[PDB]
Amino acid sequence: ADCRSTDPRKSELYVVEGDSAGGSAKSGRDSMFQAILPLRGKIINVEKA
Amino acid sequence: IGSTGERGLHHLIWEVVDNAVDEAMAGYATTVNVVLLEDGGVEVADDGRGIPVATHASGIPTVDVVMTQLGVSVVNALSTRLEVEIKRDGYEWSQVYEKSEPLGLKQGAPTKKTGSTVRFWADPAVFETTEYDFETVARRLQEMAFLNKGLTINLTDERVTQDEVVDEVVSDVAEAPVKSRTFHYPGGLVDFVKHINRTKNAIHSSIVDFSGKGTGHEVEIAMQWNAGYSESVHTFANTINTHEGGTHEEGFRSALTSVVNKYAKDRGDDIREGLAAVISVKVSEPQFEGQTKTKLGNTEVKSFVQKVCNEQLTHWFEANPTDAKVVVNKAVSSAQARIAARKSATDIGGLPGKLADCRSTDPRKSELYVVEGDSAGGSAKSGRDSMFQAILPLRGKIINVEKARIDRVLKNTEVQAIITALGTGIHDEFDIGKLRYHKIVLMADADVDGQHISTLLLTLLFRFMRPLIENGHVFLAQPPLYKLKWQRSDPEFAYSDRERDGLLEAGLKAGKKINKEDGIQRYKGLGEMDAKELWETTMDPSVRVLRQVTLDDAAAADELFSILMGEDVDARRSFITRNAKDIEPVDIEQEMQRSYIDYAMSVIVGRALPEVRDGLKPVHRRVLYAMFDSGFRPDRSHAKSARSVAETMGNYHPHGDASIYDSLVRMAQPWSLRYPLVDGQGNFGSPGNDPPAAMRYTEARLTPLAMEMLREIDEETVDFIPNYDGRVQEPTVLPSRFPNLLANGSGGIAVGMATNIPPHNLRELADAVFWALENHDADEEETLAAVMGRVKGPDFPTAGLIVGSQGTADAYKTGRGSIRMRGVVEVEEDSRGRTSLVITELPYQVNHDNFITSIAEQVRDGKLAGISNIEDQSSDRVGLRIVIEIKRDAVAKVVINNLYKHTQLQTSFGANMLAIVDGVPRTLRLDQLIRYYVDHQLDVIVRRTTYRLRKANERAHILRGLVKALDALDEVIALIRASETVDIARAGLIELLDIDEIQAQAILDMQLRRLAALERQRIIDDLAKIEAEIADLEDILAKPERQRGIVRDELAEIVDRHGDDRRTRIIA
Amino acid sequence: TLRLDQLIRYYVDHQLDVIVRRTTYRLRKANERAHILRGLVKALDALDEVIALIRASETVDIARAGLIELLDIDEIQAQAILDMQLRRLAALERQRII
Amino acid sequence: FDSGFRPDRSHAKSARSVAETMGNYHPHGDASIYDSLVRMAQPWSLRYPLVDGQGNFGSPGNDPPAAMRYTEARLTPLAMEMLREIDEETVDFIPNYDG
Amino acid sequence: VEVEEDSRGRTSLVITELPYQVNHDNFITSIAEQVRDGKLAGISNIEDQ
Ligand SMILES: Nc1ncnc2c1ncn2[C@@H]1O[C@H](COP(=O)(O)OP(=O)(O)NP(=O)(O)O)[C@@H](O)[C@H]1O
Ligand SMILES: [Mg+2]
């Protein structure tokens, strides 16, 4: 859910999980400089991987 | 007669009709009129010769002689009244029989015209039911006209309710600006095979027809071969369906095989594989053997039919060789396909651990019980008597064998399992000798699942295992209907509705105690019953009642199964819409019909269609009510979603939280409902691919609009019915003080039929309701004109645009129309001259995240061009912002146009005005939806006024009772103190003051705080307060036009505080 | 990870705690119910005057504070009397309270 | 216990006992709850069963129990001793999922 | 395990009890497969009575 702002200085990335606060973080945000990455699946354990 | 139930009750009709038709079969009667009467009788009129009226050999008229002997005599025997009108010998007669008593034949008017008429009323003191199945009757008469090439049969049903769908072809549209059917088939058996191969879709075009005159008989055969996978070879011996077989069948088969071998020299089950044929024999002295009274014995008929078939069959192949060629290219295909089918080390093979077989080696004393795994799997396996009972629990899904090829049938595990248990083969490999259990007891629930399974198995046994039914090895468990649960005594089990009252009264009268709300248990599932209960009530031979599945007409049963289980959706749809207001030998065609309708409707009402009155399916209704009754009103603070889900799950809808929360959420989502019924808190997803948060996290409560949906439900404004565990009462419909169906819309597909109603504006809808309220006495044609105009079209929450107004006017005037929807795109240039189209509005039901991707993948595969980027800049603060970057070479106007072309940015909404009107699925016009809602609202008001009057004359009685005690307080208090017990004090009150046991208990249960001066005056003033209300509601009842007004004003108020400005703009 | 004795003793210990926690609460409740019955029994002796008082006061709050002026008791004890249903003033039921 | 399903009183459908747990104590999917309910009802599972069931409660084989709408279940004389005087502040209490 | 017989003359071993937590139907299965695979010989038949 990318923000308007092109400049990374003023940009902001919010990493959620769609199941938790995806739908709502997407609504609440100042879309001018805020982007939402709702994690919609199972993340792996990258330790001994 | 055969049965005291429905099976035997119909046999009377056949015993009457069969005489009238075998008169037409003599060639004297042209038309037979069959009338199912409103009361309970049956009228069978005809234009035959006339029943012999004059005095017989005995001395009493021949009409009376035929009515009390061998036949039709049994009709009069089992009749409370049987009238016989005869038109013969230049005059017409009366002859009436009162409870089988031949009273007298009065000769009136001189009729030079011939015929007869029999009107008989069945005895309810003898039969369980006196209600005849129209479809059962309808089907058997249809074949009666097929067998006789020049006869008309006219069936009419009188007891048809004012509204109900009567039509054979139920119109997919409009339906607006006595069930009758006529049978006449000039083709004969030719017309019959056309009817058979209608759906089967035949290879060749030439129907084989030939007639064989006999030395004491007469045969007629019609044939056609199909693409289909089975033999539809229906046989008849004197209008009787010889389903078992007989010499005419085995003579035609000999002569048919000895004909297909002569034409194989040119260029068994094998041949027959395709064929749909009809053998119609006439035998002078026919005698039938068989386990059923069917199966023609007559050995000379074999030699006659084989001689007729030999000569006439070869002849067709000689004269029509071009079709004869495509016949053998199906027959030899059948051979090599089932040849290849044919074709392990130290194996038991006997169903590993998916069955629990009986100790008994002998099949004669052995019983197999086919149960559903989760239904009676464990309880049957344990309750049983292992010495002779086996349990095959079906742990899986059963295929709809009806149209499928024997390949997919035998693959399906649950089908494959059954065959392995019985031991007998399949079609060719089938040998009844190998039968391992001499009783097959199918046990399944009354629930929508159990009925769905019964249909599936009765389809299978009828097709792939017909001998098992005929020989009478297939049964149906008859489990208890009720469990009368006494407090001190052990429970008694009732199987009948009548039997319950029996044990209920007698038991109470004998001095027993039962709860008078939840005291009786109506079973729905076998899962309910304990192991012990299961043996004592439905498994033990010493107590049980079984139901023997008997086939009574295979040709009519072929029809029933080809409709409900077949591939013809429009025939099936129609049947459902017609039949919507719905030890012992049982008919297959009637169990199969009841089980189908019950399942068909449960899946229709439950998930497919909204009610016309309140627009909801039961789940939403049950969420809203559990919420209301739990007190999650808008005044009070939100409750965790889980709480509402739990309250619905535990009391009204006991199926997994899954669907319950899924509906709760939809009613909360402002992009889902035009007028949201739920007021949510937290993450309730997005119009993209974002789900809502867990039920444990989100919170919801009713909206003040949903409060109008519920408004005064507690005041007996709707009919309540007992919930799944008959512990509480659940409403059949919600009051709906605003028109929910049209206001919010409705979608849904289930069992062939689907609905798709759009959402509308409440303000525009109130206008049309006020018009209907006011202009209460106006024509369907005028009121439809008025509703359109007030209502200017659908008003989607997601807003957008409605392009044109034909599909809009279509769906209003018919009930089916296509509504074009478009999205609002704005254009904004950058800073570096880079233009970009920004989607601000998208049509209703288009998924946001699924849309962006569509464009992305369309651009990726070249189908979309001039697009360099897509961004979702949408938030709650800046609405929808799907930002499409367009190239500097590309023209923004054409890109906007190409998106309107390919993508979801433009999509037409297909409207379907389907709704459950009086339990009947119905396609409706805008005015009908309006007038049915006003109907509801006017009922709601009188009912509300009724309860209010009752619940006031109730209170006033008490208050008058209390006031009486306040003035007599010194006496009242000095009395109570002197009396030793409460009941002694209560008796003294009824003495002292002329009051009721209820007015006196009001005094006793009265707290001391209520005696302080202000509170006495509170009771004094309350009585005169309530007495003023009583005066009013008496008037409200008295004046119906005053109630019409209440509706208007109460609804204006709702649109004056909750109505809103039109979201989507209608354009052209 | 525990031996058999570790499990037996941790059990016994919890039962011994369950008893004291109960007895403490039972006693805590027994004195609560006692002061109430003490309140009502006191009111049963003055019953004539008690009844005379309640009806002589317009509101329940004048009657409540009047029920502490009359009988030397507390607001919880005075609310126990006011909420007393008339039925509880028949001979057998008055004897149940005493 | 809180819902009053003592062994004195008649059997309540499993769905009522399930809905209550899910309602204000454990707000998850009914399967996890009902599965626990069913275990305490099975005499081949618990040596001393805590649930007095009624209906198809599966088998020690591959037979599942019936739907929660069908089976009925209540507490056991022994499970009553497990809850013996919980109302009497014999144990510590904590606030539930919503509080 | 009890060992009944003298019916037709043929002997059989009837399992009257099984250790705690063995799935009955997965056990009958287990035996039957071993028998099909030859791994368990002598067993001519298995059934839940
Ligand atoms: N419309 C009719 N006109 C003249 N005679 C009739 C008519 N309908 C019935 N009958 C006569 O009524 C008689 C009595 O009926 P019934 O006892 O059923 O004998 P049946 O028809 O020979 N045998 P069944 O095969 O059992 O119907 C018949 O034998 C006919 O002769
Ligand atoms: Mg007859």
UniProtKB/Swiss-Prot annotation, chain C:
Subcellular location: Cytoplasm
Recorded superkingdom: Bacteria
Leader sequence segment: none
Task of the protein: A type II topoisomerase that negatively supercoils closed circular double-stranded (ds) DNA in an ATP-dependent manner to maintain chromosomes in an underwound state, while in the absence of ATP it relaxes supercoiled dsDNA. Also catalyzes the interconversion of other topological isomers of dsDNA rings, including catenanes. Gyrase from M.tuberculosis has higher decatenation than supercoiling activity compared to E.coli; as M.tuberculosis only has 1 type II topoisomerase, gyrase has to fulfill the decatenation function of topoisomerase IV as well. Negative supercoiling favors strand separation, and DNA replication, transcription, recombination and repair, all of which involve strand separation. Type II topoisomerases break and join 2 DNA strands simultaneously in an ATP-dependent manner.
Family: Belongs to the type II topoisomerase GyrA/ParC subunit family.
Note: When the enzyme transiently cleaves DNA a phosphotyrosine bond is formed between GyrA and DNA. In the presence of quinolones this intermediate can be trapped and is used as an indicator of drug toxicity. DNA gyrase is intrinsically more resistant to fluoroquinolone drugs than in E.coli, mutating it to resemble E.coli increases its susceptibility to fluoroquinolones (most quinolone-resistant mutations are in this subunit). Gyrase from M.tuberculosis is usually assayed in the presence of potassium glutamate (KGlu); KGlu stimulates supercoiling but inhibits DNA relaxation activity, and has concentration-dependent effects on GyrA-box mutants.
Domain notes from UniProt: The N-terminal domain (residues 1-502, also called GA57BK) forms a dimer; when reconstituted with intact GyrB or the C-terminus of GyrB (residues 448-675) can catalyze quinolone-mediated DNA breaks. The C-terminal domain (CTD, residues 514-838) contains 6 tandemly repeated subdomains known as blades, each of which is composed of a 4-stranded antiparallel beta-sheet. The blades form a circular-shaped beta-pinwheel fold arranged in a spiral around a screw axis, which binds DNA.
Subunit structure: Heterotetramer, composed of two GyrA and two GyrB chains. In the heterotetramer, GyrA contains the active site tyrosine that forms a transient covalent intermediate with DNA, while GyrB binds cofactors and catalyzes ATP hydrolysis.
Protein name, per record: DNA gyrase subunit A
Species this chain originates from: Mycobacterium tuberculosis (strain ATCC 25618 / H37Rv)
Shown segment, full-protein numbering: 355 to 452 of 838
